[PDB]
Write a protein that binds this DNA or RNA. Structure first.
Ligand SMILES: [Mg+2]
Ligand SMILES: [Mg+2]
Ligand SMILES: [Mg+2]
Ligand SMILES: [Mg+2]
Ligand SMILES: [Mg+2]
Ligand SMILES: [Mg+2]
Ligand SMILES: [Mg+2]
Ligand SMILES: [Mg+2]
Ligand SMILES: [Mg+2]
Ligand SMILES: [Mg+2]
Ligand SMILES: [Mg+2]
Ligand SMILES: [Mg+2]
Ligand SMILES: [Mg+2]
Ligand SMILES: [Mg+2]
Ligand SMILES: [Mg+2]
Ligand SMILES: [Mg+2]
Ligand SMILES: [Mg+2]
Ligand SMILES: [Mg+2]
Ligand SMILES: [Mg+2]
Ligand SMILES: [Mg+2]
Ligand SMILES: [Mg+2]
Ligand SMILES: [Mg+2]
Ligand SMILES: [Mg+2]
Ligand SMILES: [Mg+2]
Ligand SMILES: [Mg+2]
Ligand SMILES: [Mg+2]
Ligand SMILES: [Mg+2]
Ligand SMILES: [Mg+2]
Ligand SMILES: [Mg+2]
Ligand SMILES: [Mg+2]
Ligand SMILES: [Mg+2]
Ligand SMILES: [Mg+2]
Ligand SMILES: [Mg+2]
Ligand SMILES: [Mg+2]
Ligand SMILES: [Mg+2]
Ligand SMILES: [Mg+2]
Ligand SMILES: [Mg+2]
Ligand SMILES: [Zn+2]
Lengths: 142, 38, 175, 207
RNA sequence: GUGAAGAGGGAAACAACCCAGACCGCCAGCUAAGGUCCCAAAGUCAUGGUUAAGUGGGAAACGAUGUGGGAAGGCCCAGAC
RNA sequence: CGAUGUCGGCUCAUCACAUCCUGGGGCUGAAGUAGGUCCCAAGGGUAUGGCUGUUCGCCAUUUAAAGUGGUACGCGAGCUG
RNA sequence: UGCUGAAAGCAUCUAAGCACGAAACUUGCCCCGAGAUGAGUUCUCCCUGACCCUUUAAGGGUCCUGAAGGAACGUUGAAGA
């Protein structure tokens, strides 16, 4: 007997809110990636996103230990010849403070179509006020 | 400042100290004596 | 540790309020404030602020020594006030004060007019001398280092904004 | 904020010194304001201007309803200028030409004259090879556009043949020579972009 | 000895290095090399340390009051630095 | 080797830092000017001619300087030969 | 380069804290730019009819309607293969 395979028409999704005013970036992002792939759900399948929508309010006070707030650097290539742009942690915070959590979970998540779908279910905010209160999201200690 | 790769005290007034992760010799009297392990 | 062991004797006329990990101190020469480190316990032992580390840390005794020396400098500032002296040896190198700017004149074709911060006052009795009073030792050493940095004293003639508390050495202009 | 002129032609201005100034004659009609945008409504502080007069049987019903609700006469286009803090423009106002009664330098932005499918020698100022001395079918061609096998790709932004011009370009800090409040003229010095009949955004200078 | 004439698992990828010898089927279990935060199956497992360098995750002569451990010491409660 | 065309010139270049200028400094057997040497720094800039096939060179004359290297000793499905 | 400052009663630009510092990096100036699938924002204009069916669905077919606008054609352009 072919065991259970969760059909994407009948699987249901919840809504979670994560506080991030001092969580460590790597551990927080790993737990976001775990709930986003859906591995807290017993109807789990690889080829079907059984994930859960996660709203990370206050995504700029994510605290990083070590000397990483002045030493951890981020690289992205433009596409031209000399274009290797590079910004530290505090400078990436000062430019666009949600890109840090988005790059972290975009590193941890799978790659390709389903990985980009699981990332599409992750929307983060640099403040304390979201606009998805019509969804009834529940808080989650993560 | 001579940027040696082996700093070494050359009198009694010289003091070996550690700024920023490098070693330095700072002297009170002779500015030739001032060194830095780099 | 060793400086952190013998605590400071705060006299009368100088209030202190332990605002958790902040300390404020008030008096006749103005008030000061210092955010202490989060590994350092201070206490008010009714005429004396005693010191120790909060444990859970191994950076205890260095930080407690810094906290003791900072409160000592704060008490000395609020009850007496420091008074530094700079001077201008050279050819016509002349200063003046105008309330809170020090209109220097140091051979610079643009005029060097340094704007002094809040808790600092100055007086230039001799027109090659500056004497300035203050409460916060760090910022008055800062302003004195700024004025000495405007014209560092050379090793050939001793000109420039020479410290009156630190003499220098001058190389002979040989040949 | 700026004005939206139409570049008529270039001519001289003589002074009593005897100097000759290349003067461009930007006519500037009364620029109508159609819609003023603020933070709570829209997202920035900026106004919308229009000039001229289009045919009634050529302005479509969205544009005509936009202008008629805006409360001005049916113009000929739309442009949008940011508001430096200290300007509160009314939606019925009509920005005249006397805005430049105090400035000395303006920055003029317009569509440059499109010169076709211009090659490399005309476009990016390359050079040529020889016209004799053996040279065969290669008098004005680009030449080597890369290296051998590493990269193994023409690097992005390589200078090549394409369409020169017909693009918005901006000249910075041309001196205003005259402001004619009667003929509705702004007389600048130099070489502004665009041909006769081009539409030029004239702003007060930055540098 | 292995490849050649040998598949599989590991070392990201990587004939010869580590475990291992594929007769065929099974949506059964135990395990070796290697591993158990996430990509990626399994310990954000327990006990006690060490590191502050991203060392771990390329490296020498030589230099250094980095820091932890041991043992010997030579001045010192008649006053040591 | 059932083929990847091999020196130099032209035309395009792009990268590295072990920097030639410009920027910032520390020391000087640095009075000033001109310097010497060392540390950070690659954003831009970096010569015309005589002779040779030349790269290289020597030379004449400028320049703020006439960088050192890679890129199949870059570049012949682009060009002499 | 410093100011204050302890582990190290002194000293100390540093471990706590703060200030200064380059043509380098982020900006400021110019240009592209919502295919930015994360496809955004604001303004304006237009469509306000009937039934018929079975598997009832974000379903299909019929009669009337054809708006805003676009496209086509023509005269063309200091726009252009
Ligand atoms: Mg430093
Ligand atoms: Mg070295
Ligand atoms: Mg044309
Ligand atoms: Mg030529
Ligand atoms: Mg031929
Ligand atoms: Mg020909
Ligand atoms: Mg080729
Ligand atoms: Mg490739
Ligand atoms: Mg094998
Ligand atoms: Mg294998
Ligand atoms: Mg390997
Ligand atoms: Mg493998
Ligand atoms: Mg067998
Ligand atoms: Mg095992
Ligand atoms: Mg994979
Ligand atoms: Mg797992
Ligand atoms: Mg554990
Ligand atoms: Mg080593
Ligand atoms: Mg003694
Ligand atoms: Mg061959
Ligand atoms: Mg072949
Ligand atoms: Mg360098
Ligand atoms: Mg020097
Ligand atoms: Mg380069
Ligand atoms: Mg660069
Ligand atoms: Mg080369
Ligand atoms: Mg070679
Ligand atoms: Mg070659
Ligand atoms: Mg050879
Ligand atoms: Mg060739
Ligand atoms: Mg070729
Ligand atoms: Mg021949
Ligand atoms: Mg000091
Ligand atoms: Mg001290
Ligand atoms: Mg600063
Ligand atoms: Mg410049
Ligand atoms: Mg810059
Ligand atoms: Zn010395």
């Amino acid at each position: 007997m072919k065991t259970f395979t969760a059909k994407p028409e009948t699987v249901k999704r919840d809504w979670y809110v994560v506080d991030a005013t001092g969580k460590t970036l790597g551990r927080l992002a790993t737990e976001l990636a775990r709930r986003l792939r859906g591995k807290h759900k017993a109807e789990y399948t690889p080829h079907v996103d059984t994930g859960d929508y996660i709203i990370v309010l206050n995504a700029d006070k994510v605290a990083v230990t070590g000397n990483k707030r002045t030493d951890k650097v981020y690289y992205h290539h433009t596409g031209h010849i000399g274009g290797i742009k590079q910004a530290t942690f505090e400078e990436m915070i000062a430019r666009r403070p949600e890109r840090v959590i988005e790059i972290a979970v975009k590193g941890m998540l799978p790659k390709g179509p389903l990985g980009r779908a699981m990332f599409r279910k992750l929307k983060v905010y640099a403040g304390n006020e979201h606009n998805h209160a019509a969804q009834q999201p529940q808080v989650l200690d993560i | 400042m001579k940027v040696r790769a082996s700093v070494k005290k050359l009198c009694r007034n010289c003091k070996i100290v550690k700024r920023d992760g490098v070693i330095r010799v700072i002297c009170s009297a002779e500015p030739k004596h001032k060194q830095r392990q780099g | 540790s060793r400086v952190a062991k013998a605590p400071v004797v705060v006299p009368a006329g100088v209030d202190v309020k332990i605002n958790g990990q902040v300390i404020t101190i008030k008096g006749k020469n103005g008030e000061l404030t210092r955010t202490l480190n989060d590994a350092v316990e201070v206490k008010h032992a009714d005429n004396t602020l005693t010191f120790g580390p909060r444990d859970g840390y191994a950076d205890g005794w260095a930080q407690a020594g810094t906290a003791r020396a900072l409160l000592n400098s704060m008490v000395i500032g609020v009850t007496e006030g420091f008074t530094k002296k700079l001077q201008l040896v050279g050819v016509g190198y002349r200063a003046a004060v105008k309330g809170n700017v020090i209109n220097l004149s140091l051979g610079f074709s643009h005029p060097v007019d340094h704007q002094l911060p809040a808790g600092i006052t100055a007086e230039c009795p001799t027109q090659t001398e500056i004497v300035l009073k203050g409460a916060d030792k760090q910022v008055i050493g800062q302003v004195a280092a700024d004025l000495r940095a405007y014209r560092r004293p050379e090793p050939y003639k001793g000109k420039g904004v020479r410290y009156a508390d630190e003499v220098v050495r001058t190389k002979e202009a040989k040949k | 904020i700026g004005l939206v002129g139409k570049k008529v032609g270039m001519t001289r201005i003589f002074t009593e010194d005897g100097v000759s100034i290349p003067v461009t004659v930007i006519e500037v009609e009364a620029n109508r304001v159609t819609q003023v945008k603020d933070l709570a409504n829209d997202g920035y502080r900026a106004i919308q201007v229009t000039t001229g007069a289009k045919k009634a049987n050529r302005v479509t019903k969205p544009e005509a309803g936009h202008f008629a609700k805006a409360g001005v006469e049916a113009g000929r286009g739309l442009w949008e200028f940011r508001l430096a803090e200290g300007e509160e423009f009314t939606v019925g106002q009509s920005i005249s030409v006397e805005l430049f009664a105090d400035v000395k330098k303006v920055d003029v932005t317009g569509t440059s004259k499109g010169k076709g499918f211009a090659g490399t020698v005309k476009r990016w100022n390359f050079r040529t090879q020889d016209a004799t001395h053996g040279n065969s079918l290669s008098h004005r061609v680009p030449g080597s556009i890369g290296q051998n096998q590493t990269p193994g790709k023409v690097f992005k932004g390589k200078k090549m043949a394409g369409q020169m011009g017909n693009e918005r370009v901006t000249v910075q800090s041309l001196d205003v020579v005259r402001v004619d409040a009667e003929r509705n003229l702004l007389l600048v010095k130099g070489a502004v972009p665009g041909a006769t009949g081009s539409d030029l955004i004239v702003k007060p200078a930055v540098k």
